[PDB]
Design a protein around this ligand. Structure first.
Ligand SMILES: *CCC(=O)N1C[C@@H](n2nc(C#Cc3cc4ncn(C5CC5)c4cc3Cl)c(C(N)=O)c2NC)C[C@@H]1COC
Length: 279
């Protein structure tokens, strides 16, 4: 049985579990309705995302979900991160309540808007990058290293707010889960297992390339065995089609082999804010 943190505890009568969200990208996650989550509207059912355990979960799986919830409380709230809203810990299965992102992950959001009425403008793409950088600046200030920053791990709300997901979790190269995470890893993280805020900056550069390719996959047609060689030789992805020079230089600064030569997330927020101001 779990200890109760009263300020975060939600009554089970206020929660109605709904349909599963996607598959197992972020674990066993379902859509749900929570009455009274919004303070201004006490009776309004608010759609939330609930992370829970499988029916045959181990003691390790439970401790993992508890540590994830406790790390969420420690990091704190920010507009551009997926926030903790509450939990049901007493008298039943553990349910961790999180903000719901109606428009799914950033990769699919971008791929769907490659044409038509909702086709994203150049300014909209810079705004997406700026919001991800702002959320990463907050996580770096809170001593949190994401270790897998990618468009798949950024969620988009009904109001088009970018929210970084899968940050407080606890953490082969030829294998795939429908994605090859190696294509987002910095050389020092890939070859030496070294993770820092500057390795997340490299991943942000790959995420920028994903934004300006409108949800394209990095290093097209390159097997992972050849990627190791190409990164040591100093090769980088080409400029996305239709991308400006200034934004490609930001991507190239993120991909410096020397980690301290890459910009900080504070510097990236300033660089992307300057691009939004001009154009
Ligand atoms: C495989 C599925 C897929 O492609 N999906 C799922 C869908 N989705 N996922 C989320 C979520 C979440 C989330 C994020 C976390 N980061 C850390 N933690 C732990 C507490 C520490 C969590 C827990 C969870 Cl539940 C949502 C959401 N939050 O609304 C959604 N919404 C659709 C996105 C994507 C489908 O894209 C089209």
């Amino acid at each position: 049985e779990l200890p109760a943190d009263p300020k975060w505890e939600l009554s089970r009568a206020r929660l109605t579990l709904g349909k599963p969200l996607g598959e197992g990208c972020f674990g066993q996650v379902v859509m749900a309705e929570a009455i009274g989550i919004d303070k201004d509207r006490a009776a309004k059912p608010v759609t939330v995302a609930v992370k829970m355990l499988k029916d045959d979960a181990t003691d390790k799986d439970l401790s993992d979900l508890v540590s994830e919830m406790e790390m969420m409380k420690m990091i704190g709230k920010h507009k551009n991160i997926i926030n903790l809203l509450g939990a049901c810990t007493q008298g039943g299965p553990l349910y961790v309540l999180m903000e719901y992102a109606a428009k799914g992950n950033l990769r699919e959001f971008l791929r769907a808007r490659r044409s038509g009425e909702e086709q994203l403008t150049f300014k909209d793409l810079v705004s997406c990058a700026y919001q991800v950088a702002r959320g990463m600046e907050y996580l770096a200030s809170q001593k949190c290293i994401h270790r897998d920053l990618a468009a798949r791990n950024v969620l988009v709300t009904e109001d088009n707010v970018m929210k970084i997901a899968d940050f407080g979790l606890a953490r082969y190269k030829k294998t795939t889960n429908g994605r090859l995470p190696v294509k987002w890893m910095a050389p020092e993280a890939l070859f030496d297992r070294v993770y820092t805020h500057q390795s997340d900056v490299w991943s942000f550069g790959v995420l920028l390339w994903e934004i300006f390719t409108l949800g394209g996959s990095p290093y097209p047609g390159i097997p992972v065995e050849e990627l190791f060689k190409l990164l040591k030789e100093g090769h980088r992805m080409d400029k996305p089609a239709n991308c400006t020079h200034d934004l490609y230089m930001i991507m190239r600064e993120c991909w410096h082999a020397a980690p301290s030569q890459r910009p900080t997330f504070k510097q990236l927020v300033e660089d992307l804010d300057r691009v939004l101001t001009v154009t």
